[PDB]
Amino acid sequence: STKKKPLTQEQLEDARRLKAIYEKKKNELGLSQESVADKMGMGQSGVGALFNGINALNAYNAALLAKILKVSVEEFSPSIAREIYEMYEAVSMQPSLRSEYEYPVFSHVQAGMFSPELRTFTKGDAERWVSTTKKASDSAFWLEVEGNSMTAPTGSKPSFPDGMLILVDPEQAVEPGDFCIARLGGDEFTFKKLIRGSGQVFLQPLNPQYPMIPESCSVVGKVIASQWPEETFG
């Protein structure tokens, strides 16, 4: 493992998405590996290594490549986009957001969760989808809903059955009448409704087949929408 390469799976997913796009474009502008190499500050050396997934990319070089590919980043890597994007705020302060945004779904779990940092892309990949005209994301993310926590008793107010999508966003304002998630036992998540009952904090789900946690809960972030998957077609 100092002898051979590991490289994560979505670490491939990006270099792939890239690969296919390199074919079509050299055509357009008359381009090859060593040519790339030379238009930046290096050799062919890897380059393919990347497309192929032998070496993994430095966002920065990726930031070259796209320019060279006459195209954006999401088209090949979005996670990068977020990264880059982020690093900008650093300069002049403001999220223009423009059109798309991004942010992931992850392997349904707390990923340590915020307050402390997130280890970037982290153990989870889930390829991350995005697109409904999107708002302030901060440290957001989509999540698939597994546990039937709230599943409206068959035509009630709202819903949230299996496989559907909720959206985390943790840099949020969490109040009564609102949907959200909180923390339990140091480990547990559960995605629920927030209520001041007889004047206290409760978590009820739209799913009576279920109970209701009351002191020791701490909210975590305010779920903003649902979308469903896409898989719904294929």
Partner DNA sequence: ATACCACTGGCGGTGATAT
Partner DNA sequence: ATATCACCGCCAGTGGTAT
Cβ of residue 104: shortest distance to DNA, in angstroms? Answer: 20
Choose the contact partner of 179 out of DNA, its own copies, none; CB within 5 to 8 A by kind. Answer: its own copies
Which of DNA, its own copies, none does 98 bind, CB closer than 5 to 8 A by kind? its own copies
Q: Whose Cβ is closer to its own copies: residue 13's or residue 74's?
A: 74
Ranges within 10-29 binding DNA (CB under 7 A) = 19, 26
Work out whether 204 is an interface residue with DNA (CB under 7 A).
Answer: no
Helix intervals (H) in 30-58: 33-38, 48-52
Given a contact cutoff of 8 angstroms between Cβ atoms, the answer to whether 203 and 212 are in contact is yes
Residue among 53 and 80 whose Cβ is closer to its own copies: 80
Residue from 34, 75, 171, 175 binding DNA (CB under 7 A): 34
Please identify, using beta-carbon distances, which residue of 1 and 92 lies nearer to DNA.
1
**Integer angstrom CA distances of residue 23 from 2, 46, 48, 74, 198:** 32, 17, 12, 17, 65
| Residue 192 DSSP label | E
Q: Is residue 2 a contact point for DNA (CB under 7 A)?
A: yes
Which part of the chain contacts DNA (CB under 7 A), choosing from 40-48, 128-136, 143-151, 209-217? 40-48
User: Of residues 13, 16, 17, 61, which one binds DNA by CB under 7 A?
Assistant: 61
**Does position 52 bind DNA by CB under 7 A?**
yes
| Contact between 166 and 230 (Cβ < 8 Å) | no
Of 18, 50, 73, 166, the one binding DNA (CB under 7 A) is: 50
Cα-Cα end-to-end distance for the chain: 38
Q: Which two tokens stand for residue 199?
A: 């004047």
What is the SS3 assignment for 181? strand
CA distance 213 to 202: 6
Distance separating alpha carbons of residues 75 and 17, to the nearest angstrom = 7
Is 110 a binder of DNA (CB under 7 A)? no
Distance CA 219, CA 175 (A): 10
Q: Which residues contact DNA (rule: CB under 7 A)? A: 1-2, 5-6, 19, 26, 32-34, 37, 42-52, 54-58, 60-61
